[PDB]
Amino acid sequence: KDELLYLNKAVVFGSGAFGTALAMVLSKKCREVCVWHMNEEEVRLVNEKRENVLFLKGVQLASNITFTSDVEKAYNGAEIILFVIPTQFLRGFFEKSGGNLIAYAKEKQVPVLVCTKGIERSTLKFPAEIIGEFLPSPLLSVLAGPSFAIEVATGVFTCVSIASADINVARRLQRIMSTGDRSFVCWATTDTVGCEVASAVKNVLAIGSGVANGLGMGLNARAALIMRGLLEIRDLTAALGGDGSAVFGLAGLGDLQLTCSSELSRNFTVGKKLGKGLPIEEIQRAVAEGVATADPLMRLAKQLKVKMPLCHQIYEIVYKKKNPRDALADLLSCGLQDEGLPPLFK
Amino acid sequence: KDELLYLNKAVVFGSGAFGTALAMVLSKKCREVCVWHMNEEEVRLVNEKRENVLFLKGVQLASNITFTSDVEKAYNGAEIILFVIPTQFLRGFFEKSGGNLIAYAKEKQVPVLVCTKGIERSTLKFPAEIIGEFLPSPLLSVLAGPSFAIEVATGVFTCVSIASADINVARRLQRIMSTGDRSFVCWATTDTVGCEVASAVKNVLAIGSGVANGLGMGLNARAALIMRGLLEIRDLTAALGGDGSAVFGLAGLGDLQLTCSSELSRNFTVGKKLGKGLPIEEIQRAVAEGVATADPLMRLAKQLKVKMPLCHQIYEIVYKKKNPRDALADLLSCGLQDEGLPPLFK
Ligand SMILES: CCCCCCCCCCCCCCC
Numbered sequence: 001k002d003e004l005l006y007l008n009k010a011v012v013f014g015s016g017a018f019g020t021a022l023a024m025v026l027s028k029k030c031r032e033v034c035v036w037h038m039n040e041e042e043v044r045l046v047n048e049k050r051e052n053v054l055f056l057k058g059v060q061l062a063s064n065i066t067f068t069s070d071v072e073k074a075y076n077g078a079e080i081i082l083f084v085i086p087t088q089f090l091r092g093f094f095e096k097s098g099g100n101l102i103a104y105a106k107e108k109q110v111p112v113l114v115c116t117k118g119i120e121r122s123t124l125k126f127p128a129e130i131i132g133e134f135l136p137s138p139l140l141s142v143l144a145g146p147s148f149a150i151e152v153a154t155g156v157f158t159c160v161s162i163a164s165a166d167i168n169v170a171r172r173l174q175r176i177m178s179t180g181d182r183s184f185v186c187w188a189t190t191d192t193v194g195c196e197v198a199s200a201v202k203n204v205l206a207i208g209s210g211v212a213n214g215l216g217m218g219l220n221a222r223a224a225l226i227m228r229g230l231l232e233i234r235d236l237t238a239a240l241g242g243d244g245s246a247v248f249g250l251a252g253l254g255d256l257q258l259t260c261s262s263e264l265s266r267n268f269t270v271g272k273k274l275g276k277g278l279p280i281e282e283i284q285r286a287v288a289e290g291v292a293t294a295d296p297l298m299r300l301a302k303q304l305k306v307k308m309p310l311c312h313q314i315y316e317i318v319y320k321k322k323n324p325r326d327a328l329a330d331l332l333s334c335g336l337q338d339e340g341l342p343p344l345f346k
Numbered sequence: 347k348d349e350l351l352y353l354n355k356a357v358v359f360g361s362g363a364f365g366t367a368l369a370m371v372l373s374k375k376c377r378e379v380c381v382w383h384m385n386e387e388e389v390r391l392v393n394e395k396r397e398n399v400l401f402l403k404g405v406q407l408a409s410n411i412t413f414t415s416d417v418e419k420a421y422n423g424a425e426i427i428l429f430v431i432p433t434q435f436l437r438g439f440f441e442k443s444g445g446n447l448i449a450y451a452k453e454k455q456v457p458v459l460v461c462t463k464g465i466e467r468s469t470l471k472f473p474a475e476i477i478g479e480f481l482p483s484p485l486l487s488v489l490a491g492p493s494f495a496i497e498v499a500t501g502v503f504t505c506v507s508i509a510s511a512d513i514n515v516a517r518r519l520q521r522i523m524s525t526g527d528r529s530f531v532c533w534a535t536t537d538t539v540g541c542e543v544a545s546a547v548k549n550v551l552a553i554g555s556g557v558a559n560g561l562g563m564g565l566n567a568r569a570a571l572i573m574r575g576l577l578e579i580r581d582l583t584a585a586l587g588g589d590g591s592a593v594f595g596l597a598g599l600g601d602l603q604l605t606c607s608s609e610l611s612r613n614f615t616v617g618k619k620l621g622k623g624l625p626i627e628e629i630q631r632a633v634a635e636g637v638a639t640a641d642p643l644m645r646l647a648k649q650l651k652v653k654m655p656l657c658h659q660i661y662e663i664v665y666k667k668k669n670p671r672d673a674l675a676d677l678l679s680c681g682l683q684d685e686g687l688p689p690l691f692k
């Protein structure tokens with residue numbers, strides 16, 4: 001059924017750029033949309049302004065979008081729930097404020113769309129896996145793909161993938177998240193793990209991309225960082241039990257390539273500084289997603305015994321003061337090799 | 347053996363940007379390097395200047411590089427031969443001037459590196475396949491990857507793949523083409539067909555990329571054009587009998603992503619014009635590689651019954667006056683679907 005599905009209400013927990021862009025998308029398929037944001041006072045300012053001046057400045061919100069500081073009201077009546085809360089606050093939220101919400105989701109069986117990306121430091125678990133400790137897996141899907149928020153927010157042509165172990169849940173969410181004007185196009189996949197691994201690794205890789213830029217390298221080098229980096233995503237995915245079908249799709253390759261080329265992104269600028277020789281502190285004197293993700297990624301890789309050449313040097317450069325040029329050299333120390341890609345066709 | 351191999355001589359047939367960049371690379375692994383170029387008078391001007399002012403302006407040539415209009419002298423004594431002659435002149439060259447050369451290559455068993463990319467209009471065959479009608483397959487390898495010539499020429503970090511059915515021939519060429527400073531890094535693969543398909547399709551895809559830019563779309567859309575475009579490369583590869591292991595490597599994904607983002611490239615600018623509504627003639631009033639490749643690609647796809655959604659609309663926009671917005675719409679007419687990627691891991 002390529003027939004879209006329209007709803008009465010949707011709520012988005014998480015008011016940053018992407019969550020807000022996604023509200024914009026939903027505002028066209030849902031009569032009403034709420035966006036949960038902890039500070040009431042902020043909830044005010046924003047609703048007055050008709051624009052999220054905190055995280056999505058310049059975009060005027062659709063009239064059917066309303067910010068609220070009240071969890072219960074926020075989800076009350078929602079027929080789709082999206083989580084965009086940062087990884088680090090994710091578990092806390094369910095602990096302290098999601099008891100009723102969970103009960104609802106479960107009672108009413110409301111489909112949940114995980115849009116949060118990262119690795120929790122304490123358990124080395126990804127977002128949907130943490131949510132899955134609270135909500136049943138069948139209600140769980142993941143949204144991932146090349147989707148800069150501003151463009152998604154302004155309705156500029158965007159494609160994403162939606163993943164669920166049960167392809168059928170993914171297909172339904174597909175009918176809800178996809179727009180009537182074909183400006184937000186969803187593709188179904190079963191690979192949740194691949195999507196989450198890619199979503200998190202890409203940030204780490206993006207710092208490598210800036211590193212390469214700050215070291216004097218050019219576009220050929222970025223293209224190779226993306227190609228070789230992807231195999232690291234592929235390998236960590238296998239180790240975590242993913243089926244890997246998203247690696248080479250929009251959520252893996254597609255998003256990685258977009259994220260590694262976002263020159264003005266913080267991951268990129270931080271990597272460029274480091275590449276230009278600036279030390280982290282000084283660079284430090286918000287956190288780049290790749291900086292925060294690098295350490296838990298590395299602990300996870302070590303635990304699973306997964307080598308991730310680029311991620312590893314990126315972690316050493318970020319964490320252990322490694323000179324970038326030395327890191328490049330160590331990286332280049334492997335010798336001559338075969339590409340490392342299996343045939344597709346026998 | 348990760349040990350490099352140095353040689354006395356190498357020749358490059360084809361004096362455009364890439365062939366010249368590649369001479370630059372070889373000038374560091376070979377005592378002497380000749381580059382064959384048909385016009386003597388031009389051969390002069392260039393050698394006087396110590397720079398290829400015709401196709402690689404601003405790069406001063408290494409002292410050990412010499413242009414020559416004489417085939418025989420050009421290859422005489424070469425221990426590696428590179429072809430970079432344009433597709434369309436490729437067969438003509440072997441017919442009219444390669445009788446002795448072939449005899450040599452074959453007598454001395456000199457490894458041949460195919461760097462020409464495209465589809466011959468009369469036979470719908472790719473470069474190495476056309477060369478293979480003249481030289482034995484075992485002497486044949488293909489070089490492909492994300493490698494803008496200027497950067498390769500100036501020694502900026504670049505990775506490429508070298509393909510041969512016999513991985514062992516690829517590994518040897520690897521030891522020759524790879525630099526002592528690790529600035530030009532080669533990876534071995536067996537997928538010749540995938541490399542050639544990608545090398546040619548990317549140009550067609552690059553026009554779609556400009557089209558998207560000229561239509562108002564942004565980076566999310568380019569990332570999706572690259573991701574979906576790649577499957578078309580994958581599918582045509584299977585049909586042609588390739589093993590597909592290069593699709594997701596440097597020669598397929600890597601190069602495609604670089605080529606689709608080269609904003610100032612002719613494929614891109616032509617696509618942007620079309621996207622902005624300019625008709626081909628007017629745009630026409632050199633040829634963009636993607637424009638020339640679109641028609642033979644389409645005939646080849648039809649003969650093999652391979653659907654190539656994006657390439658097809660790109661051909662219709664370029665060839666049959668199709669309004670781009672209509673093409674996008676037809677393209678978007680497929681309905682909702684699954685991504686189309688198999689699992690990697692069971
Ligand atoms: C040390 C941080 C990243 C720097 C720039 C890396 C540019 C790309 C290197 C590509 C090849 C990796 C080959 C690994 C065997």
Ligand SMILES: CCCCCCCCCCCCCCC
Binds near residue numbers: 159558574659
């Ligand atoms: C008509 C020429 C190309 C225009 C821009 C295309 C942008 C990307 C479209 C991506 C999706 C294709 C889905 C095909 C089913």
